Design a protein around this ligand. Structure first.
Ligand SMILES: OC[C@@H](O)[C@@H](O)[C@H](O)[C@H](O)CO
Length: 417
């Protein structure tokens, strides 16, 4: 009777959902589902276009915690009021930092499919061999020291892998969060960019030096999913990235290293911010959809306690989508299955998008800046920083250009207001 076209990202938990929709259609027999599966940079571009232009291409959209409140405030998204009121759905069980990030003027504009922070994943075996112990709360100087000791570029072992692929939510997510730990900020309180200041220089130079010495070849091509593969296939001593990866790297069905993974907090520099981030991937409906009832039903199915149970039954408790529900972290079976759960939740809770930086800022967001202009600005700055990583431009030149383009775009948009 109704068919939903759903735009989503090519991440593992979504690929897994695509295999489980018979459960949805069995429970909702008039409703079928088809997919448009895209890399995250491209998803963002296509969904933004669709939603802004009322393109009608996607009935359900996979969107981030960045987009949800912006688009929600603008009137571009249908409110998920039926979900918010539904007893079995139990929206109160959604983690508060996550639910609150998706809510505007008392209405929920997207439902979280999974959420995450960031942390260090490392190879226990390679640490033991190098004579190293990972502190629970490492510094960046320790990470640098460790990476230098583990690299064995002859045996295709890189001491560290980090995001290098250009994109507002790819390399820029990682670098922005890392910069906070170095005492940087994107903007001062007058919305002047800060790429010409010492803390961004320190961050970017630290990153480029680290990656040139100890990272994989062509890292400027590696996003989240390429790094996940490098880590899983045993090529990476340490990877500092999304907590969602923890289940994937410890699944022996897809990870050679599954029994050798350790976890520690995002690294810092003793400045008072660690820079662990807060992200969620969410499902949303365009305002003015003529398929709201069916779309609501799908979103409720995918983001319910029952969906977690469905995945647990099929693939094991460790492999459910993380970070969305108090009841998941309270579940003894999940805790037994997922040794990374406590640190994941602790990190989701400690992430501080309200106060991301050492110096006060006019924006919110750890790894992004919560303004509508960020997609375009972050994309352009991501291209500069990827070029610096690749040795195509100097670190200093990349920062000069980032400063100039950001000034240009912000003045064009009218800041400060
Ligand atoms: O969930 C893993 C990634 O899709 C996610 O970390 C995104 O890169 C996001 O942009 C991080 O803020």
């Amino acid at each position: 009777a109704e068919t939903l076209t759903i735009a989503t990202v090519n991440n593992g938990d979504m690929i897994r959902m695509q295999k489980l929709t018979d459960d949805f259609t069995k429970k909702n027999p008039g409703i079928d589902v088809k997919w448009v599966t895209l890399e995250e940079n491209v998803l963002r571009q296509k969904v933004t276009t669709d939603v802004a232009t009322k393109g009608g291409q996607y009935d359900v959209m996979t969107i981030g915690i960045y987009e949800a409140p912006i688009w929600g405030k603008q009137g571009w998204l249908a409110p998920l009021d039926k979900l918010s009121a539904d007893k079995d759905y139990d929206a109160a069980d959604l983690l508060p930092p996550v639910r609150s990030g998706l809510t505007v003027d008392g209405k929920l504009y997207a439902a979280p499919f999974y959420a995450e922070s960031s942390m260090v994943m490392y190879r226990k075996d390679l640490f033991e061999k190098a004579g190293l112990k990972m502190p629970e709360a490492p510094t960046w100087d320790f990470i640098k020291e460790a990476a230098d000791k583990i690299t064995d570029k002859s045996k295709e072992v890189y001491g560290i892998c980090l995001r290098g692929k250009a994109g507002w939510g790819e390399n820029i997510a990682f670098l922005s969060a890392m910069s906070n730990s170095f005492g940087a900020r994107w903007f001062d309180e007058q919305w002047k960019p800060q790429f010409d200041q010492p803390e961004w220089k320190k961050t970017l130079q630290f990153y480029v030096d680290l990656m040139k010495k100890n990272g994989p070849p062509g890292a400027s091509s590696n996003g989240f999913n390429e790094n996940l593969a490098l880590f899983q296939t045993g090529k990476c001593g340490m990877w500092i990235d999304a907590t969602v990866a923890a289940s994937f790297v410890t699944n022996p069905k897809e990870s050679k290293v599954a029994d050798q993974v350790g976890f520690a907090l995002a690294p810092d520099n003793g400045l008072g911010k660690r820079g662990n981030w807060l992200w969620s991937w969410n499902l949303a409906i365009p305002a003015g959809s003529k398929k709201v009832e069916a779309a609501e039903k799908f979103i409720a199915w995918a983001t319910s306690k029952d969906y977690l149970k469905l995945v647990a039954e099929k693939d094991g408790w460790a492999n459910v989508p993380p970070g969305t529900r108090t009841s998941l972290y309270a579940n003894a079976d999940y805790q037994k299955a997922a040794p990374f759960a406590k640190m994941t939740l602790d990190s989701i809770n400690s992430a501080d998008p309200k106060h991301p930086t050492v110096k006060p800022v006019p924006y919110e967001g750890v790894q992004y800046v919560a303004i509508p202009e960020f997609q375009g600005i972050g994309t352009a700055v991501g291209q500069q920083f990827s070029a610096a990583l690749a040795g195509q431009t100097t670190v200093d030149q990349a920062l000069k250009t980032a400063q100039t383009l950001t000034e240009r775009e912000m003045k064009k948009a009218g800041y400060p207001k």
